[PDB]
Structure formats: structure tokens, C-alpha cells
């Protein structure tokens, strides 16, 4: 072995969805999408963490896609690799808008 989810308690997406109970209705990204992308709500602002890699994302923009942001900033994630595949992770990083996003900070 060697790999193990950073947050085993949130490996079940059904449990991840539950954390979005207090998710701001305000945000364009909906609980279903975020939970399916492997994220669970931190309960603070719009901060979410991935159960698998433990990476945290915040300050979501209107046109952000949970899977893309996941693959873009946390490309080594085992969950992203498992669900979306390596080709997708590579392609995401080549999209102009995302490439610039990653170069910015």
C-alpha cells in the first residue's frame, strides 16, 4: 500500500454532500458538483477540501468548474486521476484561461 485518503471520513460522496448543508446559496458551484469533484465543505466562507489529497480551494469564480480547478491546482490527486484520468489533467493545464490562472499565483 502507501496511498490513503487524507480524510477517510469523507471518502463516501454521500457524506461529502452532507457537509454542504450550510453552503452559501449565493455561489454558482452547487453542492452536487463540488461533492462529486471530491470536495467537502469546511464550513467557512467558500472553502472546500478534497477528501483524497487534502488540498483546499477557495474564492470560487462564477465560471469555475469544480473538476477543472481540482485538476489544475492539485494535479497529483489520486481521486482526480481515478475519476477523470491523466489525459484530462493534462488537457486542463493546457487551456489558456486555466494556464494563465495557474501562472498568476
Amino acid at each position: 500500500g502507501n496511498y490513503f485518503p487524507q480524510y477517510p471520513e469523507y471518502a463516501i460522496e454521500t457524506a461529502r454532500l452532507r457537509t454542504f448543508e450550510a453552503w452559501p446559496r449565493n455561489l454558482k458551484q452547487k453542492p452536487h458538483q463540488l461533492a462529486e469533484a471530491g470536495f467537502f465543505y469546511t464550513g467557512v466562507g467558500d472553502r472546500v477540501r478534497c477528501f483524497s489529497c487534502g488540498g483546499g480551494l477557495m474564492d470560487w469564480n462564477d465560471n469555475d468548474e469544480p473538476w477543472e480547478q481540482h485538476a489544475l491546482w492539485l494535479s497529483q490527486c489520486r481521486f482526480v486521476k481515478l475519476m477523470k484520468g491523466q489525459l484530462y489533467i493534462d488537457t486542463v493545464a493546457a487551456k489558456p484561461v486555466l494556464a494563465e490562472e495557474k501562472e498568476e499565483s
Binding site: Q6, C53, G55, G56, M58, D59, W60, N61, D64, L74
Partner: peptide, 8 residues
């Protein structure tokens, strides 16, 4: 979105 935490 911005990654406030990236795995070490």
C-alpha cells in the same frame, strides 16, 4: 479559485 492549501 485559489488553492489556499496545496499538499506539501
Amino acid at each position: 479559485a485559489i488553492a489556499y492549501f496545496i499538499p506539501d
